[PDB]
Structure 1
């Protein structure tokens, strides 16, 4: 046992003493000639007890175990890029003209970043190793590191160094985003950037963040979505367009909500809801196979089968069906509002404030549909116009829209529709752009963080964001 403060204070005095004796504990440059992954790839085939003594290399990394088998034989584990080798430092092999062996190695502690000049071999036990001639401290770790709560979210660097799975999680994340980018680019889509701060915040229903620009003396809204300006680009003649990036919604933090999250929205001119469904099934099934070489995955446990096609459940037909009720249109008539309210009560669930037709329908949809399936993803489709102000009216079903929303394990990860392009039907900047002619178009949104949760077996969004937002 050691007191952390003593540890820290002592390592601090050590640093100052090195400085004072003229040794620079933070040297500027150490020219490494090979990485640890490279080193392993290149020498893993060596024979037990075989040294290549005439092959000198410079290698770096973080010391993670310190050991000894006497004062003239020190062992360390050295990690870089998520791989590990042994450092076997033997007194006889040490270049004594550069410091007392014992001084130079007593000072090396767990967490230290080091540079090593030495030669590759395997120990007789077969352990792939570097045998120093010289070991340089490049950057000390001044605190004792954990061997094994909230710290993983506040000190993500600690998490990344100690837990192999943490690194796997964020690697998978970037892979997911890479796949998506190439998937859209293969299909002729054009990546763009739209503003994060606008005079209005539209394209979804969510409270916004507000901020103030000093030069223009103006209160701007951080964006809750990217829909409106992307559509303006369709009008502008960019027929396949998308954006991957953050959006901001000013509401509660939970296991599936972070106030900044990463979305992808695309707009596809001359497509419609049917094209969007096909796209969703292709994307998800191909994404999953690309990561796992199979369509069925384990999640915390339950199997999720991503083999297309997926079930499509019509929001009205299904609510009515599981509640032996008819919901007469208009959906915001008093008779249908009262009725919807009755169901809420009849089933003792939380009444939304205020109880508008759109929010009641939404609430009924979360209770009676959204957890219909767990074995596969599925779509809820054909949402009422009152919920869907920017979706186009259904081509055979008055009151409804050509909309879909994909769910995985009761959580929405996708929202898409045929875009309303008739400016007259919309009144009930962007609006001006519609008057110039928005071609028939299909639009689609993904929630990236939520997708990554499922494909890395996490059940908090916090586990797939490097630095999630938290109370200090």
Structure 2
């Protein structure tokens, strides 16, 4: 905080001297990566006649009488050395360098590209591009200091830079994979008169303009389905959803992909989802043999096994479990395993996750879900009491879901009435039901969180994968 005071004094002194420590422009000719790419093998201790204008954050300084060295680091982490020499710039210029420049300062330098006894610019000219009032921390940054000051994390930790660029490359890879298949990206409302399309409690805000509460969307699904009714063949939306969470490690704001494809079933969207994930790994990561932080390697290449929920649970419990199995039977199994109340569907999913889910290692689709827990998904084409839903588990993590969508408006109203009754202490989404009543062609939806994808591919947590986590 004394170092704060001295940097603040240098700013005021620089101003007073008619020097400008926040100039509007410096004439930067090249990024440092550009200069590096244009001199891959310069014979050591040799000079060239490529004059450049570079700019960079001084991350290392090493002074003497007649010659000061610094490492400039460009924003991407590329480095170039500058040398401030009595012979080439003023004695005044050299003294100003020594008096004026601190670690963290952004500096412009103009000069000739050379190699040292290390690629360097021997300066004719330099100025401050931006005076840092706070010194950089060093081996001096806690996990939650990183998240409270991502801007400092990105300056000092190369891994923060690579994670930031990987998320961007992953999101781009997804847009590329879907646009190549003819998906159009749509923008549906964030503020809704009622938030539907998932199981979660909404955030409420007061509209001045309508003197009512509006709800931040929990999911785009009901609006994307209106797009299907409207004649979109292939649609997706990649954007924030909001779940007002209470005792939770799941973030209240997170980026979600949803896709809808007409004249396909959950079987089709299962294939597309595998291909999309494999294409994202190829584009953004460069391999399907994923390196993890424990030094392990997770293979997502080839075909992925599919299992059914009721059969795989039957095999794990050693008895036949079906959509007919009573709640009292299932409650007794749950008790025997040491586990708003008891529902057939909720018990099937809980016992499945507890017995089969925890065991899964290779990438696996589980399909054919209980009707009670899948209000928006079509009843199975041949199997009584299940719906056409899959969940994809990749490296143990619940990653993605796909459905053969319910288009029958009368079944859909019944399912919403069941839900409305069950949480009564009861208005339905009548506009959504109205859209289904105009006719929705058969279609398949998917959902996949971007942070879950990055975690499944890399082992990084939500606190590493989102630029600016809540705090």
TM-score (norm 1): 0.91
SS across alignment from 1:467: coil
Give the deviation of 1:254 after TM superposition.
Answer: 5.4
SS across alignment from 2:82: strand
- What is residue 254 of structure 2 aligned with on the other side? 261
Deviation string, structure 1 residues 16-52 (Cα, Å, up to 9, x no partner): 1222232222112111111111111112322212212
- What is residue 247 of structure 1 aligned with on the other side? 241
- What is residue 361 of structure 1 aligned with on the other side? 348
- Out of 8, 21, 27, which is 1:12 matched to? 8
Contact 1:235–1:433 (CA under 8 A) maintained in structure 2 = yes
- What is residue 422 of structure 2 aligned with on the other side? none
Report the count of equivalent residues: 450
SS across alignment from 1:202: coil
Contact 1:212–1:218 (CA under 8 A) maintained in structure 2 = yes
| Counterpart check, 1:404 vs 2:390 | yes
Deviation string, structure 1 residues 226-277 (Cα, Å, up to 9, x no partner): 111101111100111111101111225755x221111111110001111111
Give the deviation of 1:348 after TM superposition.
Answer: 1.6
- Out of 43, 55, 63, which is 1:60 matched to? 55
CA RMSD of aligned residues (A): 1.7
SS across alignment from 1:171: helix
SS across alignment from 2:390: strand
Matches within 5 A, 1:283-294: 283-294=276-287
- Out of 124, 130, 138, which is 1:139 matched to? 130
Do the aligned partners of residues 252 and 133 (structure 1) sit closer, same or farther apart at CA in structure 2, a change above 3 Å counting?
Answer: farther
- What is residue 89 of structure 1 aligned with on the other side? 84
| Counterpart check, 1:234 vs 2:228 | yes
TM-score (norm 2): 0.92
Deviation string, structure 1 residues 117-141 (Cα, Å, up to 9, x no partner): 1111111x2x100111222112122
Deviation string, structure 1 residues 408-433 (Cα, Å, up to 9, x no partner): 23321101110011111111211000
- Name stretches of at least 5 consecutive residues in structure 2 with no aligned partner: 415-430
| Counterpart check, 1:345 vs 2:332 | no
Which stretch has the larger CA shift, 233-242 or 141-150?
141-150
Which stretch has the larger CA shift, 136-145 or 224-233?
136-145
Give the deviation of 1:89 after TM superposition.
Answer: 1.6
- Out of 6, 11, 20, which is 1:24 matched to? 20
Do the aligned partners of residues 100 and 274 (structure 1) sit closer, same or farther apart at CA in structure 2, a change above 3 Å counting?
Answer: closer
- What is residue 432 of structure 1 aligned with on the other side? 434
- 1:290 and 1:266 map into 2 onto residues whose CA distance is 20
- What is residue 271 of structure 1 aligned with on the other side? 264
SS across alignment from 1:466: coil
- 1:325 and 1:248 map into 2 onto residues whose CA distance is 40
| Counterpart check, 1:450 vs 2:452 | yes
- What is residue 374 of structure 2 aligned with on the other side? 388
Give the deviation of 1:93 after TM superposition.
Answer: 1.0
- What is residue 464 of structure 2 aligned with on the other side? 463
- Out of 207, 215, 219, which is 1:213 matched to? 207
